[PDB]
Design a protein around this ligand. Structure first.
Ligand code: FMN
Lengths: 188, 192, 49, 64, 63, 112
């Protein structure tokens, strides 16, 4: 009896059409005692709710720790992808058989958070909706002979990073990773 | 037990743990389940949202009252496993709570004897209150499955499993259940 | 037609199960029962005997 | 384009774990945007959790 | 798996007493939503190819 | 293994899961649940002493519902060992001289 009675008790509240008399009072609705004392307004858009709580935290955090002044908030290009564990304008790097991968990509990325920083430390990128491994780190994965040259390193908008390798003896340019028009990274 | 910035800000800042004579102890973010059950674009049926909005609730000092009696419009009832669940105290759930205190807490050797004794009570209450009604009622009259005709069964499977408003079977597996039963009727009553 | 118009061609059959009956006697409607016996018989027999 | 979401799997339901862990590993190897996996209703053993941590290409594991 | 349209066609030839061939027919099979080419399925069973591979009893290692 | 986790699990979902496993994975779950049972019986033994000591004469109704509670969990474990037992057993199984036949009086019956 206990199984028959209790078996599959949680869909009914979403589908009253399929309950005798379309009667809520028959039904199991899951809800917290304490949290119930804030659930007052029916059919509030989820964005309105979740923003409410977030914009509430800012309004306050701003008051305590930034003397009610948005101008004191550190600006960054893009917020995200920081594992919770951890300036030169015209440089030249030279991969060996020793060069550690993590060190090598810190260097190319540089200090500032911009398109170059993403390009070399973003582990993933998006084709349409899917998440493919970052091809720009595949290409620049270091090995004996490959020679990176950065130019305008300290002004993102014109920075150019230019990989060169051995090609039929001599050393020629094989990749040219840069900005086109403002929001497009070309990897020629 | 979170709903706004105001109750959740002391946990962001670390100052919640000051109240208990500890040093500040701040948290890296929050989760809101219960809060978000009445949002515009969940599937919770309108009448259920009204039922949620009606639950007054209770502060953290008092929430453990739920193990005894409806507290802010909310009780705890045991699952089939004995895990607590926090549910709004609808008629349904109050019946569930009654049967936890009376029938399901009995040892196995007292269980079947008690069901025979309380049978007509249990059926009145399933039909009146609970989301799963007693199967074998025809025209509001509580039978048993052995005192129902093959027709009375077919007609009642359709009543409980087929939705007249949408004109469809709630779940295809339910349609296969009734279809299998009609195929039994043919097997049982055909000569050839 | 692969096994699409040579596989959905085939129907479902009902093998009968045994519905053993008690064979209680068929009771006819009253109007048909009064043909069989003569009309004078009503109230004439002591059914206790 | 670029959005993610996650997946809750009840630990005390051995059947959902049996079809659902392989389903993530599969969809995550095709690059579906599944940022993380919360295991509800329990905490797995070290040897299990170790297999979730290494084998499903997840950003983080939720534990309740 | 299902074909939108199947089409088999070609000359039918007869070997004459002299062993010159002559056209005496045409294959003209056309279909809509089909799962197969029946013409080739027919000729595989009821006919033969001009050449027939025959396996040695034992494969011989050359090198 | 998520079957045998020292905590009560719903038996319908256990039975279904247990179907799809290898025989050595079943053998592992069975070992694990048996060990859980032994831990609960050695726990219920200790609880049996502190009852028998105190029943020699509050904080006795508490020792009593600690052993009532262990029997709820223990019922789930041996309900789980029974499903394992059932799954084990499923894997094992899957002259004539009268002219009645030929009429030899007739010319054509022989083989005309
Ligand atoms: C309707 C409802 C369903 C829930 N379902 C699950 C679940 O399937 N798995 C789970 O781990 N937690 C579940 N929870 C718990 C939430 O994940 C979370 O712990 C809780 O809602 C937060 O508490 P609050 O409701 O007091 O805000 C559920 C909570 C509610 C209200």
């Amino acid at each position: 009896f206990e199984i028959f009675f209790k078996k599959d008790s949680l869909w009914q509240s979403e589908h009253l059409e399929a309950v005798v008399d379309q009667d809520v009072q028959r039904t199991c609705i899951l809800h917290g005692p304490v949290a119930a004392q804030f659930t007052k307004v029916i059919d509030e858009p989820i964005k309105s709710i979740m923003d409410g709580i977030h914009d509430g935290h800012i309004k306050k955090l701003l008051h305590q720790y930034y003397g009610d002044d948005e101008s004191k908030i550190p600006a960054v290009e893009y917020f995200g992808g920081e594992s919770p564990v951890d300036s030169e304008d015209s440089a030249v790097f030279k991969a060996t058989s020793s060069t550690d991968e993590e060190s090598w990509f810190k260097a190319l990325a540089g200090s500032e958070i911009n398109w170059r920083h993403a390009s070399f430390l973003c582990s993933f990128i998006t084709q349409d909706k899917m998440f493919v491994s970052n091809p720009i780190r595949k290409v620049f994965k270091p090995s004996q002979g490959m020679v990176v040259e950065i130019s305008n390193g300290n002004t993102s908008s014109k920075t150019v990073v230019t990989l060169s390798e051995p090609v039929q003896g001599e050393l020629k340019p094989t990749v040219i990773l840069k900005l086109l028009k403002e929001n497009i990274i070309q990897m020629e | 037990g979170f709903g706004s910035a105001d109750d959740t800000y002391p946990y962001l800042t670390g100052e919640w743990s000051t109240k208990f004579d500890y040093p500040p102890m701040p948290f890296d973010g929050f989760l809101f389940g219960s809060r978000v059950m009445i949002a515009k674009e969940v599937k919770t049926s309108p009448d259920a949202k009204k039922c949620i909005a009606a639950c007054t609730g209770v502060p953290d000092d008092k929430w453990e009252q739920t193990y005894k009696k409806p507290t802010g419009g909310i009780v705890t009832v045991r699952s089939e496993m004995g895990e607590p669940i926090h549910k709004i105290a609808t008629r349904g759930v109050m019946l569930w709570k009654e049967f936890d205190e009376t029938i399901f807490n009995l040892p196995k050797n007292k269980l079947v004897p008690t069901l025979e004794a309380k049978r007509d009570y249990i059926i009145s209450r399933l039909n009146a209150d609970f989301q799963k009604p007693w199967f074998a009622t025809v025209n509001g009259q509580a039978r048993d499955l052995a005192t129902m005709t093959y027709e009375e069964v077919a007609k009642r499977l359709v009543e409980l499993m087929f939705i007249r408003s949408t004109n469809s079977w709630f779940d295809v597996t339910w349609r296969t259940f009734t279809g299998d039963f009609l195929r039994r009727v043919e097997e049982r009553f055909t000569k050839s | 037609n692969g096994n699409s118009a040579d596989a959905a061609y085939a129907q479902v059959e009902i093998q009968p199960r045994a519905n053993i009956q008690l064979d209680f006697p068929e009771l006819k409607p009253y109007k048909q029962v009064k043909q069989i016996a003569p009309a004078e018989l009503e109230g004439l027999l002591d059914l206790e005997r | 384009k670029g959005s993610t979401f996650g997946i809750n799997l009840i630990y005390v339901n051995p059947f959902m774990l049996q079809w659902g862990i392989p389903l993530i590993k599969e969809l995550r190897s095709k690059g579906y945007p599944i940022q993380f996996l919360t295991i509800g209703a329990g905490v797995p053993s070290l040897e299990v959790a170790s297999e979730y941590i290494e084998t499903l290409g997840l950003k983080y594991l939720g534990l309740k | 798996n299902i074909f939108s349209s199947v089409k088999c066609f070609g000359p039918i030839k007869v070997e004459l007493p002299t062993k010159e061939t002559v056209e005496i027919g045409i294959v003209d099979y056309e279909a809509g939503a089909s799962h197969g080419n029946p013409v080739v399925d027919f000729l595989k069973r009821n006919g033969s190819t001009l050449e027939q591979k025959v396996n040695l009893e034992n494969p011989i290692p050359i090198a | 293994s998520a079957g045998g986790i020292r905590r009560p699990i719903q038996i319908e979902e256990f039975k279904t899961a247990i179907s799809g496993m290898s025989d050595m994975e079943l053998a592992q779950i069975k070992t694990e649940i048996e060990n859980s049972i032994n831990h609960l019986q050695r726990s219920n033994a200790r609880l049996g002493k502190y009852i028998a000591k105190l029943e020699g004469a509050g904080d006795l109704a508490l020792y009593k519902d600690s052993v009532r509670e262990n029997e709820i969990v223990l019922n789930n474990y041996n309900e789980r060992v029974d499903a394992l037992e059932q799954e084990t057993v499923y894997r094992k199984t899957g002259v004539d001289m009268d002219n009645s036949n030929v009429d030899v009086v007739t010319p054509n019956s022989i083989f005309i």
